[PDB]
């Protein structure tokens, strides 16, 4: 997964 509880990596 990318986006989640610790943020994202755009």
């Amino acid at each position, epitope marked *: 997964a990318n986006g*989640g509880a610790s943020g994202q990596v755009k």
Partner: antibody
Amino acid sequence: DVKLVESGGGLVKPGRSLKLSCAASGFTFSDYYMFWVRQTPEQRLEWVATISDGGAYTYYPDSVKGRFTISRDNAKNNLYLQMNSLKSEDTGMYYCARDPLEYYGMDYWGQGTSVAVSS
Amino acid sequence: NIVMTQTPLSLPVSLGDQASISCRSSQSLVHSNGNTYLHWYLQKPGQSPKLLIYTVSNRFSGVPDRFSGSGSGTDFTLKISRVEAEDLGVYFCSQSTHFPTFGGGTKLEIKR
């Protein structure tokens, strides 16, 4: 430059509720995931909430799940935290913080807003 | 539920000294994408934490090159080549590879 300003903290009786706000400026607010992080009286830091850039996705640790709601207004550049069923263990300084675009992290934090829960 | 532990609890230093602080994670900090989201922050009294080092060794904007980070897997350290009075406060490590968690903090203080 990037600025975040939290406000709204105060004293609330146990079981009660309060809303915190966090004004963002100096960046495109709508492009960044945002967090709420608190620091207890004994000075430990605890992550309390995450919200995706667009607002559809929200994340919480088990300590707060079902009582706290993070939200945001991308037109007004405001991040929010509605706290329900407050407990004495929620007593602490509340900070909002930003997620950088290229790595999972917290680059900028506000000056904070204090919450105290007591009868 | 990734536990972050800091050593030492307190590190007294004299101005001009070298300074080293360690941060141990309960499980690997390597993300599925290969990167290690391990960061360091400094907090002064009355102020919020400020980002110093991100993703193990990257200096954040404005941070002097006196600060460096390294480590791997689960064991990481922040170094200060030469301590100045403005460096004093509490240093925190945190991990963002799983839901965010923070170490308990290492207070850098003036030796007496």
